[PDB]
Amino acid sequence: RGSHMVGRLIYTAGGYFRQSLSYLEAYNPSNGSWLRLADLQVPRSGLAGCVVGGLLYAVGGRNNSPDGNTDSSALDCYNPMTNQWSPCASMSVPRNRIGVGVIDGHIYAVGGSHGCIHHSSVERYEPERDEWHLVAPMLTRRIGVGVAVLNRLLYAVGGFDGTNRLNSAECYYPERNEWRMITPMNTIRSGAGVCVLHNCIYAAGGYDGQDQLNSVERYDVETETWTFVAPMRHHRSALGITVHQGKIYVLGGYDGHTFLDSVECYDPDSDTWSEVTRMTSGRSGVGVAVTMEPC
Ligand SMILES: COC(=O)/C=C/C(=O)OC
Ligand SMILES: COC(=O)/C=C/C(=O)OC
Ligand SMILES: COC(=O)/C=C/C(=O)OC
CB 250 within 8 A of CB 232: yes
Q: Which ligand is nearest to the CA of 106?
A: 2
Between the CA of 165 and the centroid of ligand 3 the distance, in Å, is: 10
Sequence-distant (6+) residues with CB within 8 A of 165 are: 158, 159, 188, 189, 190, 207, 208, 209
Q: Is 105 in the pocket of ligand 2 (CB under 6 A)?
A: yes
CB atoms near residue 231 (< 10 Å): 15
CA atoms of 27 and 261, how far apart (whole Å): 13
Between the CA of 218 and the centroid of ligand 3 the distance, in Å, is: 23
- Kindly report the protein residue whose alpha carbon is nearest to atom 8 of ligand 3: 207
Sequence-distant (6+) residues with CB within 8 A of 283 are: 15, 16, 17, 21, 23, 252, 259, 260, 261
DSSP state of 276: E
Q: Is 207 in the pocket of ligand 3 (CB under 6 A)?
A: yes
Q: Is 46 in the pocket of ligand 1 (CB under 6 A)?
A: yes
Q: Is 266 in the pocket of ligand 1 (CB under 6 A)?
A: no
Of 237, 257, 259, best ligand 3 pocket probe by most atoms within 8 Å of the beta carbon:
237
Q: Which ligand is nearest to the CA of 235?
A: 3
Q: Is 72 in the pocket of ligand 1 (CB under 6 A)?
A: no
CA atoms of 29 and 42, how far apart (whole Å): 28
Domain range annotation of the chain: 1-295
Q: For 135-157, give the DSSP string.
A: -PPPSS--BS-EEEEETTEEEEE
Between the CA of 279 and the centroid of ligand 2 the distance, in Å, is: 26
CA atoms of 264 and 251, how far apart (whole Å): 7
Q: Which ligand is nearest to the CA of 189?
A: 3
Q: Is 53 in the pocket of ligand 2 (CB under 6 A)?
A: yes
Angstrom CA distances, 232 to 204, 220, 273, stand at 8, 20, 6
Sequence-distant (6+) residues with CB within 8 A of 70 are: 62, 63, 94
CA atoms of 187 and 272, how far apart (whole Å): 20
Closest alpha carbon to 76 in 11, 29, 145, 9: 11
CA atoms of 213 and 286, how far apart (whole Å): 18
CB 193 within 8 A of CB 146: yes
For residue 162, report the phi and psi dihedrals to the nearest 5 degrees: 105, -20
